[PDB]
Amino acid sequence: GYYPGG
Amino acid sequence: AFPGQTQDPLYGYFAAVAGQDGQIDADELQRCLTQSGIAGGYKPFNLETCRLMVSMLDRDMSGTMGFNEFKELWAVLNGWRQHFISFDTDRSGTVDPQELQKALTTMGFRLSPQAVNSIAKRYSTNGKITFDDYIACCVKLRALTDSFRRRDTAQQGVVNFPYDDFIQCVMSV
Ligand SMILES: [Ca+2]
Ligand SMILES: [Ca+2]
Ligand SMILES: [Ca+2]
Known part of the structure; x- marks a missing residue:
């Protein structure tokens, strides 16, 4: 989860 | 390779x-x-x-x-830059606590607004979060939330943490 989730 | x-x-x-x-x-x-x-x-x-x-x-x-x-x-980094720019709605080059609350909500986090405000101050001098710190904050939140979720097998929003597990988990991010 090192990428943005929005 | x-x-x-x-x-x-x-x-x-x-x-x-x-x-x-x-x-x-x-x-x-x-x-x-x-x-x-x-x-x-x-x-x-x-x-x-x-x-x-x-x-x-x-x-x-x-x-x-x-x-x-x-x-x-x-x-x-390019992805984070886009994400940062997008929540910096007043184009200050920083994400304030209100901007951070929206960013985190939009990412699917469900956090106490007081806690968000506290977190914002912990990653800035004056509430105004720079790009490098925005990434750190968001990544750490995801990592800790993920760790909690994995241990929360009943999905009841409460985890029993033995000390060893607590320390190793938290000290690793
Ligand atoms: Ca080297
Ligand atoms: Ca390597
Ligand atoms: Ca801003």
Whole structure:
């Protein structure tokens, strides 16, 4: 989860 | 992995940053991202953000960053930059606590607004979060939330943490 989730 | 990757245009830059051992450590990365200017200003690019990136992009459990990992790093930073710009709705070059609350909600986090405000102050001097710190904050939140979720087998929003598990889990991000 090192990428943005929005 | 791919010895002929020396022909990739990014390779020279990678190799200069990596230096003698042909791998990038977080201190080397810190210097790179600082001198790249991506965070803007004059402050160093946060070392903790560099350590999180080295750890999370690691493909071979080497604890260091190689060329394919460095290539991915730039794509990841570009994604975060877009995400940052998008929640910086007054174009201040910083994310304030109200902007952060929206960002985190939009990412699917469900946090106490007071806690968000406290977190924002913990990652800034005056509530105004710079790019490097925005990444650190958001990545740490995701990592801790993920860890909690994995232990919350009943999905009841409460985890029994033995001390050893608590320390190892928290001290690792
Ligand atoms: Ca090196
Ligand atoms: Ca590696
Ligand atoms: Ca702003």
